Amino acid sequence: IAKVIYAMMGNKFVVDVDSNGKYVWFEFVLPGQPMNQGEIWKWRKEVNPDELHIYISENFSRVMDRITEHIKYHLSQPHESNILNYYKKLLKAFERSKSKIFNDSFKKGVIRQAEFLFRQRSFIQTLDTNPHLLGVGNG
């Protein structure tokens, strides 16, 4: 799941390790989303990614359903017995495994695993190094 998710938001989350050793997340505020006053077009710190979990549960289901209907289509076409049986076992296992994306412990494990992929070395110490950039209320 983590590789696909990294393919999902490669431009919206960054994981970095502070001096104290606890991983922290940063996300890019986009217009038209829940937010505080005047942090548009800026990176904000975060501890427990909310939108990440919501995306795990909501948007990923569409790709899961795409896989399911692709399996439907391949099963529909006429073929030999062995291939049909193989597809039947594949579908039977996959539908059982598909419901796991809603489990809390599974989501926590997925986040913990994915925090390694999202890491970008040397990101905290390069914040605000440029003196010519200032963050204002509207950009």
């Binding site: 289509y73 419901s99 809603f102």
Partner: protein, 382 residues
């Protein structure tokens, strides 16, 4: 609602139809109001311009799903060339089934044949009917997709049949108390439905009989009504399609879009219908609810507009322009944050004990969606 999800779940042909619509028919996009569309589904208001191959494939798949017993809502709009679509609504005094007979149907065939020969000429008759047991009794639809003469001649024929009393004489022989107004003036001027498509809270039409009457250009006096049914062999959806010239058996002789976007908008519309319109009449509380809904996103502007048409004397010269003025003010407003909570509170106040079943049905359907989708495998976050 629930039945649609169930059929989508335990029927593979519904999955095939959905995949076909999403993949193959998506590229055949058509504008919502353009005349180029030939197939329209009112469930999602989809419009398509399928060529002959896509049309026949859809006809066959609709045939399979109908033979399985699904629920269809497809429609087709007649072009400049089409067969004969007739919307015969029987309004009987008594809701008792009339035993129509093949001889009477053939007599009706001869009557309409006489009615239509008074024009340019050079055929299969299909008689389908409602399942009866309903107020005002059932309805009938004769379908003649053989020819192609969709023009003002169709309007002339409809006008000629409008005043016909021999057909009314047959109806009175069958004990019908609606000899007139039974045939709508827009009989061929409305988008009909493909065979097997049902109606909202109404069972789909089922075929009654099929007849064959070959046109005789040399001897129009000869009217040989003779047919062999064998109706299971033919693809009924494809054969009965008006635009399908290449059928086997037959021969070629605003707010609605918003509620489609959001079921929560449907919910809001219901709860808005719940409370009395007195609060709408006065400017203060109506402006309060306008601000409350404006806080909930910006695409709900038509929805308030829908609530605006009530009391048009207040809407026009007033409400119409002051509504948009208030919306422009709320576009920058951050001082007040009245939300939908106040609306549910008001609904609970004014009409108690009646919105509770509405919300119960709402989240009952919400969870039923999940339980159908995931085969009862309950888990967190659901």
């Amino acid at each position: 609602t629930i039945q649609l999800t169930a059929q989508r779940k335990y029927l593979a042909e519904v999955q095939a139809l959905e995949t076909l619509l999403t993949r193959e028919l998506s590229v055949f996009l058509t504008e919502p109001g353009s005349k180029k569309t030939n197939i329209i589904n009112r469930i999602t208001g989809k419009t398509y311009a399928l060529p002959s191959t896509e049309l026949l494939r859809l006809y066959e798949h609709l045939e399979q799903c109908r033979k399985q017993g699904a629920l269809m809502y497809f429609l087709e709009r007649q072009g400049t060339y089409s067969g004969l679509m007739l919307d015969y609504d029987l309004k009987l005094n008594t809701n008792a089934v009339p035993p129509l007979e093949p001889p009477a149907l053939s007599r009706l065939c001869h009557r309409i044949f006489v009615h239509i020969k008074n024009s340019s000429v050079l055929i299969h008759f299909f008689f389908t009917l409602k399942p009866e047991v309903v107020q005002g009794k059932y309805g009938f639809h004769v379908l003649i997709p053989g020819l192609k003469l969709a023009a003002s001649t169709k309007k002339s024929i409809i006008g000629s049949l409008q005043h016909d009393a021999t057909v009314q004489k047959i109806l009175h022989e069958q004990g019908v108390t609606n000899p007139e107004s039974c045939l709508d003036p827009h009989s061929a001027s409305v988008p009909s439905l493909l065979y097997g498509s049902s109606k909202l809270n109404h069972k789909p039409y089922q075929l009654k009989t099929g007849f064959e009457l070959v046109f005789d250009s040399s001897d129009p006096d000869y009217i040989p009504i003779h047919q062999i049914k064998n109706l299971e062999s033919y693809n009924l959806v494809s054969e009965l399609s008006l635009t399908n010239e290449q059928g086997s058996l037959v021969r070629p002789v605003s707010l609605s879009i918003l509620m489609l976007h959001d079921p929560e908008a449907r919910y809001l519309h219901k709860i808005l219908n719940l409370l009395p319109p007195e609060y709408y009449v006065e400017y203060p509380l109506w402006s309060n609810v306008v601000f409350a809904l404006a806080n909930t996103s910006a695409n709900y502007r038509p929805l308030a507009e829908w609530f605006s048409q009530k009391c048009p004397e207040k809407w026009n010269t007033g409400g119409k322009e002051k509504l948009e003025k208030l919306w422009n003010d709320a576009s920058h407003h951050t001082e007040k944050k009245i939300t939908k909570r106040s609306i549910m509170y008001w609904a609970h106040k004014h009409a108690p004990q009646q919105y509770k079943e509405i919300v119960e049905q709402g989240y009952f359907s919400i969870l039923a969606e999940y339980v159908y989708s995931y085969n009862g495998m309950l888990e967190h976050y659901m």
